[PDB]
């Protein structure tokens with residue numbers, strides 16, 4: 134359903150150069166998971182019914198960063214400012230989504246297709262649209278389905294983003310990594326979900342909800358058994374997420 | 382002059398998966414410069430006149446690792462063994478060259494084209510073919526030109542590989558990084574060469590030789606002024622290096 138806008142040759146040149154610089158920066162700084170979280174929280178405010186929110190640069194606003202669910206994302210925005218300044222032609226919206234795509238790539242994940250042209254919008258969406266870690270499948274469908282317009286498959290695949298990174302007791306309150314290799318993008322999130330609670334690894338109530346839902350569970354099983362299938366569905370879902378409200 | 386061999390679909394699938402896994406591993410382990418050094422020392426033993434040496438997996442042999450110029454590369458080989466074992470179909474030769482290509486990519490450098498099909502050869506080349514850091518332009522031409530068959534342009538561009546990493550007093554004896562950002566691949570090696578010896582940054586006699594040679598100096602100037610030109614020439618040179626003796 135996408136009709137991507139035209140951007141100038143200079144814009145495309147900046148996208149390509151920024152992608153390279155983001156690889157080096159994100160790898161060196163060890164901030165891939167934080168950048169993926171930034172991209173997801175930027176995009177995840179989209180409401181399809183009103184066509185409000187989504188990946189339009191508003192997460193840079195102190196007002197949006199102050200949202201409870203966005204604790205710690207001010208670090209991500211600050212980390213990217215010097216590099217963003219080297220690419221003044223790029224929108225913040227494109228830059229943050231490119232950082233999310235790069236975060237997945239540098240940690241060994243699939244290559245998520247990227248299309249430039251998001252415009253920075255003036256007003257942050259209302260607070261409270263982002264997923265709630267303490268709730269289950271009904272709420273996941275409310276957020277990803279009813280608001281964002283993504284599928285049940287997308288929900289499970291995107292939950293696999295937790296294969297990189299960790300929670301922090303000072304941010305959400307939850308604490309620790311989902312996987313034994315929090316800078317490696319693979320299907321281990323699903324493997325860990327299936328094996329039960331191993332010592333030192335995190336499972337949110339929202340992660341656990343995937344195991345007991347009739348639609349989500351077969352997907353968990355599939356991804357645990359078949360990393361290639363996970364990578365394919367993940368790339369599809371991440372692309373859709375990164376493009377909510379954009380190019381239709 | 383290259384006619385690349387055919388490899389099976391399964392081989393190509395392993396190349397693509399290994400490339401991803403190498404990105405994640407190399408980024409996490411912070412070993413990009415060591416892996417680039419490994420790939421360069423593997424390839425740099427090629428002698429065009431005899432068609433001996435080159436990137437054919439022999440650097441994995443304890444006998445080749447024992448070469449003075451290869452101090453510390455046993456670490457690189459060890460680091461890669463677990464991942465290599467996940468891709469039994471791949472030659473070590475291809476795996477090490479792919480690691481070098483990935484090292485450049487993850488640090489923000491150009492995308493160096495990669496072609497599979499190098500076969501692992503039984504016998505390491507004689508010791509003493511690798512570049513000597515204490516010598517100058519004549520010796521650089523002996524090694525890169527007379528032996529490897531690379532151009533003067535290739536010599537200067539490849540010297541820019543020192544934009545990542547550092548020397549170690551326990552390995553070569555030289556000590557410290559060439560650049561202020563040793564995990565970032567950019568044209569800073571050349572910028573530093575031109576500005577003089579800044580505190581805490583390394584310049585080998587072989588680096589300094591580039592500044593006073595009539596052919597090498599204009600290239601240093603070009604790369605210092607134009608990072609895009611450096612990236613283009615670097616990608617060309619690295620590809621050629623990685624393919625010495627291979628596919629003609």
Ligand code: HEM
Nearest residue numbers: 166169170173264265266291294298299300301304305339
């Ligand atoms: C499915 C609903 C989701 C819930 C309930 C959820 C919740 C959370 C929570 C509570 C944290 C911990 C924040 C902290 O304390 O630092 C977190 C972190 C993270 N989230 Fe999710 N999230 C969801 C979806 C996503 C999606 C769609 C992505 C991207 C594909 C994503 C990527 C990440 C990453 C990479 C981290 C680690 C951040 C770091 O290491 O600093 N999450 N998420």
Ligand code: HEM
Nearest residue numbers: 414417418421512513514539542546547548549552553587
């Ligand atoms: C031009 C002739 C060259 C000379 C004289 C030379 C010499 C050296 C020396 C003495 C070291 C330090 C080893 C140590 O003590 O750890 C080193 C490291 C390194 N070399 Fe070169 N080299 C040359 C060419 C190359 C090429 C062609 C490449 C790849 C394009 C390369 C990539 C590297 C890298 C990335 C390191 C850092 C390794 C680390 O951080 O552990 N070098 N080189």
Ligand code: NA
Nearest residue numbers: 175188190229
């Ligand atoms: Na955004």
Ligand code: NA
Nearest residue numbers: 296312314317
């Ligand atoms: Na992981």
Ligand code: NA
Nearest residue numbers: 423436438477
């Ligand atoms: Na090799």
Ligand code: NA
Nearest residue numbers: 544560562565
């Ligand atoms: Na550097």
